[PDB]
């Protein structure tokens, strides 16, 4: 079991988009105060991930990366490859040198 990773199984409210919740507060599932410790109606929201080589395909540790793109008043910075063609000379052609 690869227990390095943890998942916030429980939370007091739904996280807002593009928000990270890292607080390790003992989740209170009931009306009994947790007092900083788990127990009756008190558990740990950041439960442990268990990954083994013989686990199920949908249960394997999957590395997921999401690439959000931000366009704002600031100048654009992350542009595309902008492939360039070959070069010709002494021929009537339609050229484009950086716009």
């Amino acid at each position: 079991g690869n227990y390095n990773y943890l998942y916030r199984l429980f939370r007091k409210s739904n996280l807002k988009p593009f928000e990270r919740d890292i607080s390790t507060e003992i989740y209170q599932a009931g009306s009994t105060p947790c007092n900083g410790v788990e127990g009756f109606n008190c558990y740990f929201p950041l439960q442990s991930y268990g990954f083994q080589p013989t686990n199920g395909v949908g249960y394997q540790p999957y590395r997921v990366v999401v690439l959000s793109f931000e366009l704002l008043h600031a100048p654009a910075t992350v542009c595309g490859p902008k492939k360039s063609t070959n070069l010709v000379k002494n021929k009537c052609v339609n050229f484009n040198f950086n716009g």
């Binding site: 079991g1 599932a29 009931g30 009306s31 009994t32 558990y43 439960q47 268990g50 013989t54 199920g56």
Partner: protein, 652 residues
């Protein structure tokens, strides 16, 4: 027409402004916490129950959180426990022995703690059926509902009989040091040697060394099993086992433990004419073999059935074959002709299981499971078991050889795991069969379909030129009756015997005698040597000593018959039911998967209704399956008297 709800701080303002409230507009006052509905020329007070103190934390929310937390951790603990058991089952080693010792200790202590935690979550205030059912399984204390001393002594007595049954050995009088265990020393000699004397001595010696020793232990085991059954709100330990089949709170599908007994008795009573014909013909073949040892009217000998408990008559199939000159159906020699192994057996099993429309299963099981004994460096168990290790890990323990018998058991084993991962969407508690008679039924139905000659011809196991005459069909049907129908009366009665043994209706000084009386009138089998109540022959069963309910086998047989009939109806099979094959029928697999995915969350009665169409079990598939054999037995019973006689005995 639309309206809404109106509020007022005080009822004085409500009375003044009630004239302006249109009909259909609700009037609420916070001072009196009273609700009213605006009606024609007035307002009608809405009846309100006791005011709750805003219990925003119900037990349902706490139970759901506790269940989810339990299921997440229980998955890991059970997973590593299953790995260690598989490692031991594939390699028996001293380091492996302590592995389940630690794994079982942690799992048991963890289970009792979660059961203890679930104790303060009563099911009365829980409305979710899944939550209520899962916590009911969690709150099942079992042996711990009583005091610790009662649990400790019950476990010690359970360990004693389990060890005694495992080490049950009998020695020949002439050779004191020459002794044979029940498995396989005793079983091999009685199943192979047809000698009356040797089988009688082995039967008598086994019940003398084991029956006498386990009689006080079984009675103490039964007494303690009645002690925590009533502590678990059951009239006997038999009712405790029957609680699994009980369905409560499901309108239109509720089932009671008493209903199971009545339906099982009703099924056996209508089955009886078919069994009597089979018993008569098997008896008729017995005078053919031994004319001076079996009466034409008397019951069959206990040791002359192929099983010392009288379970299966498969060993008698050669002795009771309808036609001994017609060769039997077997394509094992064709497998070695095509150079096949256990890997090809499982590979063809998957090909059959995807021909029925169900999707192919992953590659993890193939590389994580052995299909042949791992040489001799590491000792492994070859018993047919299914490993529901969890976390999407599934394994099969089988030293499968290139044989038809191993081919069918391999089909049986993959059907078990194919049932296991079908309901993977269920939580950890609900990732199980609906009843104990369903997992074996799933593996049995399609293994028989694989064994059908049409399946063998389709994938080349049997040559297409094979002729399908009634002679081979009758021989196959009789073998099915001996192996399947033959064990039904023994399965029904022994569970019936053990039920009232827990109930205490039949006194201790009559149990075995009532068993033998039931062996004669009901089973139609008579013991060859008279004994006393010191003998505890029903306790000589593996399941009785190892605390296993025996009703699983009789229920599974009728469950699998219903499943096979529904499979043939879905496949629109024409002709004899025993030749019905589900291969190359995608719709049949889809219909089966409709309940395979369902799991144990729904009542098993609903699952049975979804498969065939009847909420209650029925024996209709039995008649359709064995109709050619039933007519053949009726025709051949010109000398086979239908039934048996209680009066006659091998010793009397």
């Amino acid at each position: 027409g639309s309206s809404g709800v109106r509020l007022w701080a005080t009822r004085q303002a409500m009375l003044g402004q009630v004239h302006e409230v249109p009909e259909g507009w609700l009037i609420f006052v916070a001072e009196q916490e009273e609700l009213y509905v605006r009606v024609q020329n007035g307002f009608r007070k809405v009846q309100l129950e006791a005011r709750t103190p805003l219990p925003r934390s119900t037990i349902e929310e706490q139970a759901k959180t506790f269940l989810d937390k339990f299921n997440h951790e229980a998955e890991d603990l059970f997973y590593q426990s299953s790995l260690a058991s598989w490692n031991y089952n594939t390699n028996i080693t001293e380091e492996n022995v302590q592995n389940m010792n630690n794994a079982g200790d942690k799992w048991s202590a963890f289970l009792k703690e979660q059961s203890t935690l679930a104790q303060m979550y009563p099911l009365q205030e829980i409305q979710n059926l899944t939550v209520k059912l899962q916590l009911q399984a969690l709150q099942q204390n079992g042996s711990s509902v009583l005091s610790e001393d009662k649990s400790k002594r019950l476990n010690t007595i359970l360990n004693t009989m389990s060890t005694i049954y495992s080490t049950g050995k009998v020695c020949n009088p002439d050779n004191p040091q020459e002794c044979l265990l029940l498995e396989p020393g005793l079983n091999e000699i009685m199943a192979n040697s047809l000698d009356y004397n040797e089988r009688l001595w082995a039967w008598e010696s086994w019940r003398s060394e084991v029956g006498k020793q386990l009689r006080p232990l079984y009675e103490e085991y039964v007494v303690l099993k009645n002690e925590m059954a009533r502590a678990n709100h059951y009239e006997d330990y038999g009712d405790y086992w029957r609680g699994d089949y009980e369905v409560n709170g499901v309108d239109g599908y509720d089932y009671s433990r008493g209903q199971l007994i009545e339906d099982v008795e009703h099924t056996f009573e209508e089955i009886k004419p078919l069994y009597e014909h089979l018993h008569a013909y098997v008896r008729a073949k017995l005078m053919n073999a031994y004319p001076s040892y079996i009466s034409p009217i008397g019951c069959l000998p206990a040791h002359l059935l192929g099983d010392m408990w009288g379970r299966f008559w498969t060993n008698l199939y050669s002795l009771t074959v309808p036609f001994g000159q017609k060769p039997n159906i077997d394509v094992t020699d064709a497998m070695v002709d095509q150079a096949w192994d256990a890997q090809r057996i499982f590979k063809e099993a998957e090909k059959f299981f995807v021909s029925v429309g169900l999707p192919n299963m992953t590659q993890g099981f193939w590389e994580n499971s052995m299909l042949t004994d791992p040489g001799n460096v590491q000792k492994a168990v070859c018993h047919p078991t299914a490993w529901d290790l969890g976390k999407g890990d599934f394994r099969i323990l089988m030293c499968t050889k290139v044989t038809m018998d191993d081919f069918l058991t391999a089909h049986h084993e993959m059907g078990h795991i194919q049932y296991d991962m079908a309901y993977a969407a269920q939580p950890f508690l609900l990732r199980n069969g609906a009843n104990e008679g369903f997992h074996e039924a799933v593996g049995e139905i399609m293994s028989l379909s694989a064994a059908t000659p049409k399946h063998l011809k389709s994938i080349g196991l049997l040559s297409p030129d094979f002729q399908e005459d009634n002679e081979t069909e009758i021989n196959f049907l009789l073998k099915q009756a001996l192996t399947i129908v033959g064990t039904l009366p023994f399965t029904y009665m022994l569970e019936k015997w053990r039920w009232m043994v827990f109930k205490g209706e039949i006194p201790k000084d009559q149990w075995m005698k009532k068993w033998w009386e039931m062996k004669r009138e009901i089973v139609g089998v008579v013991e060859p040597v008279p004994h006393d109540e010191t003998y505890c022959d029903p306790a000589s069963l593996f399941h009785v000593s190892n605390d296993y309910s025996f009703i699983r086998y009789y229920t599974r047989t009728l469950y699998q018959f219903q499943f096979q009939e529904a499979l043939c109806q879905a496949a629109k099979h024409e002709g004899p039911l025993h030749k019905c094959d589900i291969s190359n029928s995608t719709e049949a697999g889809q219909k089966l998967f409709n309940m395979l995915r369902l799991g144990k969350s729904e009542p098993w009665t609903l699952a049975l209704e979804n498969v065939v169409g009847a909420k209650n079990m029925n024996v209709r598939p039995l008649l359709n399956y064995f109709e050619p054999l039933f007519t053949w037995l009726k025709d051949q019973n010109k000398n086979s008297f239908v039934g048996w006689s209680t009066d006659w005995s091998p010793y009397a």
